[PDB]
């Protein structure tokens, strides 16, 4: 498990900008977006996993992610949370 941040491929970032209403994208946007996503995921997984452990579990649950998102003000509906 090494360099998966590149799984977020140029095409996929483009589709996301599109849904976002973006018509033209500069070449340096793709590395910037990966950076942004990495921090976002780091913060959510950090909190989610803290919930896992407090409950002495080895399996991260949907609820763990949902409580982590609510802590960060990004309430998500649909998975129990």
């Amino acid at each position: 498990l090494r360099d998966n941040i590149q799984g977020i491929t140029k095409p996929a970032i483009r589709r996301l900008a599109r849904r976002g209403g973006v018509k033209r994208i500069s070449g340096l946007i793709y590395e910037e977006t990966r950076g942004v996503l990495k921090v976002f995921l780091e913060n959510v997984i950090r909190d989610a996993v803290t919930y896992t452990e407090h409950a002495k579990r080895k399996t991260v649950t949907a609820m763990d992610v949902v409580y982590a998102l609510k802590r960060q003000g990004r309430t998500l509906y649909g998975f129990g949370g």
């Binding site: 309430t75 509906y77 649909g78 998975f79 129990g80 949370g81």
Partner: protein, 92 residues
């Protein structure tokens, strides 16, 4: 055993749109919505009661909570259904 508001959501769905269904993922979101508003109102009520050194949450705290949490028109109608329900409940 795990409860959800699914059947009540479904009854209500049948009153407003007698011939419309709902996919499970959508019911799931509806269950989320109801639990969300519930915690938001109760919590608002909880603080409300504390700030006033009261140890009881009544229909009155729930009402202020509703006023602080919901936007304009939605509150107006929520407060109505709420007052209405308590009055009707109290006569039986």
């Amino acid at each position: 055993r795990k409860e959800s508001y699914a059947i009540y959501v479904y009854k209500v769905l049948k009153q407003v749109h007698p011939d419309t269904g709902i996919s499970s993922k959508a019911m799931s979101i509806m269950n989320s919505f109801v639990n969300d508003v519930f915690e938001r109102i109760a919590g608002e009520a909880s603080r409300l009661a504390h700030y006033n050194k009261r140890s009881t949450i009544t229909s009155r705290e729930i009402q202020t909570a509703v006023r602080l949490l919901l936007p304009g028109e939605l509150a107006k109608h929520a407060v109505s259904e709420g007052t209405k329900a308590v009055t009707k409940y109290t006569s039986a």
